[PDB]
């Protein structure tokens, strides 16, 4: 089964990385153990959605393409290694983002930097190592592959887009005209930059390239199937589903119980440009806008409660339903367009959408 | 002249990166200005020793190889872009290291994260962007080059070695057997791991791969000259000169005036495994070892003063002279061995050594 293959490959790649640290980097057993625990704590525990998308896209093509059994095994192993490169890339950004944001919990456990024996001094570098491991995986496992060049180039572009998206996210509550490294940044008072187009830019870059575009294209590359698809359609469907995924996350930050969320959501306190805040400002009257401005971005729990009441009273569930209906309509249209050149790839996209939507 | 070409290429690469952010990443002018200032503040102001080594190695080969003038210009431009990849890689590690270490100043100015309009939340990501820019440079400028694969593979290996070296450095005052992410780390009390071999491991990985190996090998790659040298000799001379460079830095941290150093050195307070501490413990009597243990790794200025007195009284200048004489002897021996296959490359190494030694 796909998941068991994927998890077995994690143990293989971990053993390869740690054994290389011992044979080539002069590591001692205690530091190798620290790095093993860091890898497990930061890479494991999630749903493996991104990595398993690579595997599922590759399985779709195997079902319809003639190959010797050894070639089928090679392609699946490559899809698993590629999927772990994306999981380790995500692990890098979660470790760093948690330190940047001063976060407390991630997936029901303390953020890595908060572990007593880690601290920010080590965790920033541990995050650097996580992303370096993605490149060590690629050069080792894909050394003789025809797709190595395209895969590394895609991966770099996606990583850069993600870092640019993090910049857009962390500065989303500043007035753009005031940004200046030499001057402490005040929070926006007018919220003029909390618009659907600005929110779409943040989300497109901060999450959609690594959560949807990279796994789908990597599945095509390891399958040597990229010429069988219209790349512009793949980008459009990846950016569309990815935005919906971030809207779901934004709603959950505000209203999903902390036990289910795996943390205490603080987007209101952090003055984030969330879908809820943009959608609220898109329908609020003058008194509602004024109440929002007087309470948003404040740690005071009573102020956070005022904001959640404004969102609840504004009936944002109706705006979410209209948005969800439009996304269902557009994703189904793109899936139809993908069937022109590849019904197998269109089906993988339908699975990815179904898993996101539910 | 070499320096003017190198600086002109910085402006070209900066314009390329920022123009790409506008045409492909939807950046606005204010964020483009923030990134321009971040690039200038974190990449410029140093001696450009690493980047200029690439240029000097390439100039050496141009002097003895037949090429059309357009090819000479292409090779020099590539050497400048490669040199800036290494300068931006260093910029990434300085930004992150300063945050990890809680540093105050770097090159006579505040550390980047301390700028009022930056903060740790932005600076960690700015550091991530600096390293991503090295890959954008490579894929753009070297897209059609025969050396692209080897250059990217070398660069990844050097980056990984550096991150591993940072782990060795940050944990150098812990007892290895006590390292555990779940347990807050006490400082060593026995200093048994402050040995010449453990110090050599820290230094080899944390600085020598990116400061000496990477510039020398990159100069060979852009010149298509790597088969003209014995790679094992290049590694040995790079690791040897690089260690001497770090010993010089360690002595300067303790005894160079802050105005000349560009910061207030705090290796004693930070309990670093410095050359001074290892060399002191290698010659101290029992009472001197006990006094060192009672004062090292403490913020108290009177305790720091006791350590500097112990170092001064131990006549560490005599150990430095013996070490320096041994390094001069070994670097000259390796330069001689390099002349067997390439007198031009051996001369570049002699220049690199001369610039380091003085
Ligand atoms: O999650 C937390 C943890 C601790 C906390 N303490 C106080 C808070 C509540 N907010 C106070 C204001 N604010 C700001 N953000 C920016 C970003 C850019 C420019 C100006 C501002 S003003 C976010 C945090 C909080 C939240
Ligand atoms: O004032 C508060 C504070 C905390 C609270 N926790 C739960 C609640 C009660 N409802 C508030 C509104 N709601 C939403 N569901 C969606 C789904 C999609 C998009 C927007 C929304 S809005 C369901 C829960 C509540 C109220
Ligand atoms: O530069 C500074 C800035 C602020 C400061 N405050 C106090 C100090 C002085 N030292 C106190 C002890 N110490 C430790 N390091 C480690 C690392 C690993 C394991 C245990 C320890 S115990 C370094 C700092 C200091 C220095
Ligand atoms: O007690 C103190 C405290 C601060 C101080 N600043 C300057 C001093 C006075 N000398 C102390 C020793 N020295 C060193 N030069 C080298 C060079 C190579 C290797 C080891 C050393 S040791 C020169 C300056 C001093 C003393
Ligand atoms: Zn964040
Ligand atoms: Zn969120
Ligand atoms: Zn450091
Ligand atoms: Zn130093």
Closest Cα to residue B242, out of B115, B116, B97, B352? B352
Residues 6+ away with beta carbon under 8 Å from B38: A181, B112, B118, B126, B129, B130
What is the number of domains present in chain B?
A: 1
What CATH number corresponds to the domain at position A34? Answer: 1.10.600.10
- What's the CA gap between B237 and B243, in Å, rounded? 10
Residues 6+ away with beta carbon under 8 Å from A175: A186, A188, A190, A192, A193
- Please choose from A189, A271, A303 the residue to mutate so as to test ligand 1's pocket, defined by most ligand atoms within 8 A of CB: A271
Closest Cα to residue B228, out of B50, B61, B53? B61
C-alpha gyration radius of chain A: 22
Which of the 8 DSSP states describes residue B188?
Answer: P
- Please choose from A173, A174, A303 the residue to mutate so as to test ligand 1's pocket, defined by most ligand atoms within 8 A of CB: A173
C-beta neighbour count of A184 within 10 angstroms: 10
- Which residues, judged by CB distance below 6 Å to any ligand atom, belong to the binding site of ligand 1? A 102, 173-174, 185-187, 266, 269-271, 297-299
Q: Which ligand is nearest to the CA of A274?
A: 6
- Which range marks the domain in which residue A64 is found? 1-358
Q: Which residues of A243-281 are buried (b: 16+ CB within 10 A; e: fewer)?
A: bbbbbbbbbebbeeeeeebbbebbbbbbbbbbbbbbbbb
Beta pairing partners, A106 = A109
Considering only CB atoms, A118 lies closest to which of B33, B41, B181, namely B181
C-beta neighbour count of A286 within 10 angstroms: 7
Q: Which residues of B touch A179 (CB under 8 A)?
A: 30-31, 33-34, 117
Q: Angle B81-B82-B83 (CA atoms, 0-180°, nearest 5)? A: 90
Q: Which residues of B21-57 are buried (b: 16+ CB within 10 A; e: fewer)?
A: beeebbbbebbbbbbebbbebbbeeeebbbbbbbbbb
CB pairs under 8 A between A and B: 159
The residue length of chain A stands at: 358
Backbone phi, psi, residue B264, to 5°: -95, 115
Closest Cα to residue B310, out of B330, B326, B334, B290? B290
Method: X-ray
Residue minimizing CA distance to atom 21 of ligand 1:
A187
- H-helix or E-strand containing B223? none
Structure tokens at B80: 């400048």
């Amino acid at each position: 089964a796909s998941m068991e293959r994927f998890l077995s490959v994690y143990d293989e790649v971990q053993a390869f990385l740690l054994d290389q640290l011992q044979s080539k980097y002069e590591i001692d057993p205690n530091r190798a153990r620290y790095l093993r625990i860091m890898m497990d704590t930061t890479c494991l525990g999630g749903k493996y959605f991104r990595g398993m998308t690579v595997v599922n896209v590759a399985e779709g093509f195997l079902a319809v393409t003639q190959h010797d059994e050894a070639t089928k095994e090679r392609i699946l192993h490559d899809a698993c290694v590629g999927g772990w490169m994306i999981e380790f890339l995500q692990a890098h950004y979660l470790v760093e983002d948690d330190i940047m944001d001063g976060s407390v919990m991630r997936r029901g456990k303390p953020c890595w930097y908060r572990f007593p024996g880690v601290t920010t001094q080590c965790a920033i570098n541990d995050g650097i190592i996580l992303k370096s491991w993605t490149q060590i995986m690629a050069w080792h496992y894909f050394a003789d592959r025809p797709f190595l060049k395209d895969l590394l180039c895609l991966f770099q572009k996606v990583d850069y887009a993600t870092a640019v998206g993090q910049m857009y996210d962390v500065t989303s509550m500043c007035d753009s005209n005031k940004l200046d490294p030499e001057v402490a940044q005040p929070m926006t008072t007018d919220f003029a930059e909390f618009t659907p187009a600005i929110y779409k830019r943040i989300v497109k870059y901060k999450t959609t390239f690594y959560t949807y575009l990279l796994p789908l294209v990597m599945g095509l590359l390891v399958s040597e199937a990229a010429a069988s698809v219209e790349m512009n359609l793949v980008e459009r469907v990846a950016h569309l589903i990815g935005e919906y995924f971030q809207v779901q996350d934004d709603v959950m930050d505000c209203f999903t119980p902390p036990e289910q969320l795996g943390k205490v959501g603080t987007d209101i306190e952090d003055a984030k440009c969330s879908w809820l805040a943009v959608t609220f400002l898109g329908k609020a009257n003058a008194a509602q806008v004024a109440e929002f401005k007087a309470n948003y971005g404040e740690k005071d729990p009573a102020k956070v409660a005022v904001v959640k009441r404004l969102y609840s009273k504004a009936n944002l569930q109706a705006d979410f339903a209209a948005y969800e209906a439009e996304v269902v309509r557009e994703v189904e249209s793109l899936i139809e367009q993908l069937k022109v050149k590849s019904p197998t790839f269109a089906e993988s996209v339908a699975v990815v959408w179904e898993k996101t939507h539910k």
